Paper text:
We deleted this N-terminal transmembrane helix and included a His8-tag for purification purposes, resulting in soluble expression of SaNSR. SaNSR protein was crystallized and cubic crystals were obtained that diffracted up to 2.2 Å resolution. We solved the structure by Single Anomalous Dispersion (SAD) phasing, using crystals of selenomethionine-substituted protein (data and refinement statistics are shown in Table 1). The asymmetric unit contained four copies of SaNSR that were virtually identical (root mean square deviation (RMSD) between the monomers = 0.15–0.5 Å over 300 amino acids). A SaNSR monomer consists of eleven helices (α1-α11) and eleven β-strands (βa-βk), which form three domains: an N-terminal helical bundle and two protease subdomains. Altogether, these domains form a hydrophobic tunnel of ~10 Å width, which could very well harbor the nisin molecule. The protease core domain is formed by six strands βb-βg and five helices α5-α9. It contains the highly conserved TASSAEM region that harbors the previously identified catalytically active serine at position 23622. N-pep is predominantly bound to SaNSR via direct backbone interactions to amino acids 167NNTGGN172 of β-strand βd, which is part of the protease core domain and is structurally located on the opposite site of the TASSAEM sequence motif. The presence of N-pep within the tunnel is clearly an induced artifact of the crystallization procedure, since in the full-length SaNSR protein, another 30 amino acids are attached at the N-terminus of the N-pep sequence that form a transmembrane helix. Out of all residues of this helix, only the side chain of Asp110 is intruding into the tunnel, which neither forms an interaction to N-pep in the crystal structure nor in the NSRTail MD simulations. This suggests that the protease cap is not adopting a fully closed state, rather an intermediate state.
NSR is a member of the S41 protease family, specifically the C-terminal processing peptidases (CTPs). NSR from L. lactis TS1640 has been shown to degrade nisin by cleaving the peptide bond between MeLan28 in ring E and Ser29. In this study, we report the first structure of a nisin resistance protein, NSR from S. agalactiae COH1 (SaNSR). The present study reveals that the lanthionine ring E of nisin determines substrate specificity of the nisin resistance protein (NSR) and contributes to the coordination of the nisin cleavage site at the catalytic center.
Author numbering: 31 to 317
The structure:
Amino acid sequence: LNIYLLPPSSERYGRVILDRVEQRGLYSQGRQWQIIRQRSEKKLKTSKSYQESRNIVQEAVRYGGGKHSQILSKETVRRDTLDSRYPEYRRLNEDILLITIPSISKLDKRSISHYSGKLQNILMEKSYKGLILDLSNNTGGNMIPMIGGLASILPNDTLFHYTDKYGNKKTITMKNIPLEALKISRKTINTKHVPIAIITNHKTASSAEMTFLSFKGLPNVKSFGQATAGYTTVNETFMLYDGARLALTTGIVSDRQGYKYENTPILPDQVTSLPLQESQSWLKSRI
């Protein structure tokens, strides 16, 4: 077809990332920020490729956005997509299901609907009186299939809040979740009410942590295990010219109860190295 393309220079490509970082990053203002930015622009003047430009702005991204921010090359983004897994369950006994809820980074509608659908089926069509939700080793990815699959046990209300560098406070509610895309019905939201035990470990991160926050303060819920990884900030992701992605931190976070998080670990209710064990016992007492 009839195509016109005049791709940015490697310098331009680098400067585009600096503009975004400055525009939305939590920390990208003030004396230390320029200097880092100025130093980055000086190197970019002689950059000879996009890859080189990403290397050059790395300090700026890390400073301007913090430890939850980064630039992923197109290749890195795809390899990470291929690490995606689907939820699994095992019946522990006639009353308790153990549900494994893993990392998934996929965007495509089919994959994310298979992930959420698997969860939906377990929660809606299986028999139980209590649940164990296992977020160990879930380092995040696409929030949509995670929150979506768990829709039946979450409020049709505020999930968590987040505030940007300009002091704009916003809210992620069950409505902001594209359930329609997963072909899941809003009539199923919050229709299961059983004791829920949630397990986390040190690797539990990011989307998984914000999924964890979405259960906080629920009276039927209690959590076991260890503090999470501490990537409790909202990111916005910007697709760059060659398919690379800028993941940029733009929001500080608070849960329904008013507690604030800024790349800070979440404490489970009951810290322990035996959370499956203590989980079941807790579930027994409440059943």
